[PDB]
Design a protein. Structure first.
Length: 113
């Protein structure tokens, strides 16, 4: 099953992103901090990283820079959520459009090997 790591400090956004992804049958990993995202990514190898750029403690774009500098994490597609192209494969605007949100993520997640 595909695993998506959601990096989102806002409880409401995290729940919405989680519910939408779970309804699609995906497993998720969750964290409110950019640094933790790096740690979790190395420990659980998510298939895609959904990251809010406007985190309170750090820019999501700087976190993406670290991701791309790591040989084990650089291949993981990163979708930025902003209220980028930093290394992000795609961007999703907030307030989000549910279909656009899911289409963007599924396109990057569900590719033939």
């Amino acid at each position: 099953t595909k695993k998506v790591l959601i990096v989102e400090d806002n409880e409401l956004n995290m729940k919405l992103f989680h519910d939408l992804l779970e309804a699609q049958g995906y497993e998720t990993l969750q964290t409110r901090e950019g640094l933790s995202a790096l740690s979790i990514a190395r420990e659980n190898k998510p298939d895609l990283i959904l990251m809010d750029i406007q985190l309170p403690e750090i820019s999501g774009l700087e976190v993406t820079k670290w991701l791309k500098e790591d040989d084990d994490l650089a291949h993981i597609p990163v979708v930025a959520v902003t209220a980028i192209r930093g290394g992000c494969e795609a961007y999703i605007s907030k307030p989000i459009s549910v279909v656009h949100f899911l289409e963007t993520i599924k396109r990057l997640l569900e590719r033939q090997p």
